[PDB]
Ligand SMILES: Nc1ncnc2c1ncn2[C@@H]1O[C@H](COP(=O)(O)OP(=O)(O)OP(=O)(O)O)[C@@H](O)[C@H]1O
């Protein structure tokens with residue numbers, strides 16, 4: 119008769135027109151979902167809400183599963199609700215999906231046994247919708263699974279009895295697993311929202327997902343929020359300015375939830391005729407401020423309130439009934455008070471439960487429970503469950519304990535916490551950090567950036583400085599401004615760190631990290647800085663070099679691998695080399711520092727007081743043209759001993775240039791990395807000359823070249839020289855065969871300095887190895903790995919090599935492949 123899908127769209131539009139779908143909105147004002155402030159969405163590249171499920175750029179491969187990850191408060195629910203409304207309004211997926219089914223994971227039970235009847239309860243009031251009709255057909259239906267991490271109770275990601283078929287009733291965990299794994303109603307689309315931490319389990323269900331990260335408000339979007347929140351423009355501007363002046367809070371406000379909390383606080387202060395001051399610095403300070411302002415205008419119910427929250431965390435319960443409120447001393451009068459002020463919500467769409475306005479608030483109270491003046495009240499058992507899904511990870515519960523357990527405390531509710539307990543907890547928290555600071559990642563989590571968000575929450579230097587004494591090595595990945603703010607605070611107070619590794623994720627290409635590099639330059643203990651494999655391009659190097667010229671820098675080793683640097687950055691690197699007398703090791707591998715960049719770099723390398731000892735220029739798009747400048751550096755440098763230039767186009771002519779100066783007996787070169795440089799036997803006479811004259815050269819790496827047997831003979835003329843002191847010779851993958859074995863054998867029985875000789879991916883043959891075995895027994899000085907890896911031989915040869923290892927144990931390592 120009529121198309122029932124129209125009624126469903128009408129239902130969705132009337133239901134999702136508001137932000138919460140719940141009452142107690144500070145007098146239940148209309149929240150107006152049209153206020154939605156745009157969130158930043160990055161595909162793992164910026165994307166639009168439309169075309170989200172389109173096939174990718176090759177093979178036209180379709181996507182069924184899309185996962186949206188983000189922090190608590192970033193807007194995963196407001197965004198998923200927005201999609202429901204936009205679709206129902208005909209502004210999104212108009213010709214892609216016939217239905218959108220919104221699944222609220224805080225309502226789904228992992229214990230209760232049910233068929234796929236959620237499709238009934240999640241839609242119109244009609245108790246008997248046409249489930250068996252065309253709505254049963256996949257490819258036109260998208261499910262929105264909102265809050266994977268909010269599922270209450272243990273969840274097993276590995277299930278034997280997957281139980282497909284929507285008609286069969288089964289446990290919620292099994293049912294969700296089959297839906298996520300696309301075994302139940304396959305070829306349907308599924309969108310999942312989750313906190314990044316819960317991906318530890320979800321990753322096993324998804325198989326081949328598309329991932330999108332949700333980022334909060336840009337500075338422009340923060341302003342829009344305030345202007346939309348406050349209908350009075352004069353107030354909106356005053357509020358914005360007050361916050362803008364608070365750099366720390368402004369930074370935190372990238373999270374929509376933080377903006378909401380702050381705005382609500384200011385609104386209440388306006389109504390009461392207060393100063394409107396907002397001086398919060400930490401997440402805890404913001405939450406305490408908010409709750410205090412609401413409780414001030416009652417406060418004797420804090421115990422029951424906190425106890426309720428704590429129970430919910432331990433028993434995995436978010437939704438409460440009147441019985442649960444009464445069981446904790448909450449009954450009607452105070453409950454209503456907590457609806458007038460926005461602490462609880464009841465739900466308005468023909469439902470009656472109670473819950474906290476946000477999971478972070480429930481966790482806040484659950485944390486405060488431990489400090490007041492009944493699951494445990496033992497912080498030890500709490501911490502033991504930190505990394506577990508089963509308890510909701512307790513990330514904010516612990517993070518808030520750090521903030522609450524602080525000597526720098528004030529009045530209003532906070533004063534009701536016990537000082538004796540606070541000290542007991544404080545000490546346990548220090549022990550917890552010491553233990554977690556020394557651990558393997560293993561996807562478990564108090565991840566160093568996380569221990570730093572914990573430390574940031576308490577500004578007490580006496581605590582933080584001691585906590586930071588457990589981090590001799592810091593490895594972190596920063597994606598947002600808040601990550602930098604937190605990292606800088608902790609590093610500024612760390613006097614033990616010797617090695618620091620900083621990753622940068624899509625927000626370098628800019629100066630975002632300037633406020634962190636300015637910290638590193640004042641560190642006295644830091645000696646090694648690793649900034650590899652991140653987009654620290656030219657402008658980023660300029661900032662770093664500015665800080666490396668600081669008189670107290672003390673950085674000795676700097677690793678700059680795939681940083682996206684070009685020749686211009688060498689100008690600034692040179693300036694550092696000409697001033698900073700402490701820098702010893704510099705790795706510039708895998709950059710675009712072509713011949714010109716080296717010419718510039720060499721200006722610093724040839725400078726008096728440049729003490730650089732080790733330089734890596736591997737895969738830097740170099741060719742023979744630059745060898746003239748490198749040769750000049752080798753000729754005069756008093757400190758450069760290690761030079762690695764492989765994986766470049768330094769052909770025979772380039773090597774001959776370097777050799778012309780390297781052969782000088784006064785040259786300090788000790789290790790030469792002429793690896794995958796396209797050398798042939800033509801240049802071996804040059805290398806031979808160097809070996810014969812330069813007694814300081816101890817390591818030569820020629821693997822990947824094509825020297826052949828002729829090259830070996832030429833090198834042997836030098837290697838067999840009485841004044842040659844080479845200790846390590848690597849000739850892997852040099853296109854050598856059995857015809858060179860006579861000369862290699864001669865080397866083994868004549869060289870006095872050789873200790874390690876490495877042959878590898880080449881057709882040495884069985885005759886070759888057997889001949890070596892027969893001479894390696896005759897008081898050979900060779901002690902180290904003989905190589906012969908990635909080589910295959912007959913049974914006799916394998917036995918002979920094993921025999922040699924037992925008979926002549928001085929040659930400890932042969933390293934056969936089998
Ligand atoms: N785009 C937006 N515009 C304005 N406010 C927003 C937006 N996104 C989120 N908020 C604010 O954030 C608060 C809660 O955020 P939200 O509940 O979406 O966080 P979440 O952790 O993603 O949710 P859930 O835990 O339910 O998945 C709301 O009170 C709302 O005011």
Ligand SMILES: CN1CCC[C@@H](Nc2ccc(-c3ccc(C(F)(F)F)cc3O)nn2)C1
Pocket residue numbers: 189190191192315373375376401404478513565567568571
């Ligand atoms: C688990 N941990 C690993 C290391 C990186 C860290 N990243 C974030 C991102 C965001 C927030 C965050 C902080 C305060 C708030 C509040 F104020 F709204 F409560 C809401 C948040 O979402 N906290 N940590 C997560």
